[PDB]
Amino acid sequence: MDPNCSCAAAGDSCTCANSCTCKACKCTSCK
Ligand SMILES: [Cd+2]
Ligand SMILES: [Cd+2]
Ligand SMILES: [Cd+2]
């Protein structure tokens, strides 16, 4: 369930290099 952003999990491999989805991503790959 991706509400606004389900990244910054530390360890896991988020996919913010292809196409971001989070509505409120805070990853350095999408500011
Ligand atoms: Cd990410
Ligand atoms: Cd992102
Ligand atoms: Cd995110």
Swiss-Prot record:
This protein's GO CC annotations: cytoplasm; nucleus
Modified residues (N-acetylmethionine): M1
Domain of life of the organism encoding this protein: Eukaryota
Binding site for a divalent metal cation 1: C5, C7, C22, C25
Gene Ontology biological-process entries: cellular response to cadmium ion; cellular response to copper ion; cellular response to zinc ion; detoxification of copper ion; intracellular zinc ion homeostasis; negative regulation of growth
Comment block on domains: Class I metallothioneins contain 2 metal-binding domains: four divalent ions are chelated within cluster A of the alpha domain and are coordinated via cysteinyl thiolate bridges to 11 cysteine ligands. Cluster B, the corresponding region within the beta domain, can ligate three divalent ions to 9 cysteines.
Function statement: Metallothioneins have a high content of cysteine residues that bind various heavy metals; these proteins are transcriptionally regulated by both heavy metals and glucocorticoids.
Name this protein carries in UniProt: Metallothionein-2A
Organism phylogeny: Eukaryota, Metazoa, Chordata, Craniata, Vertebrata
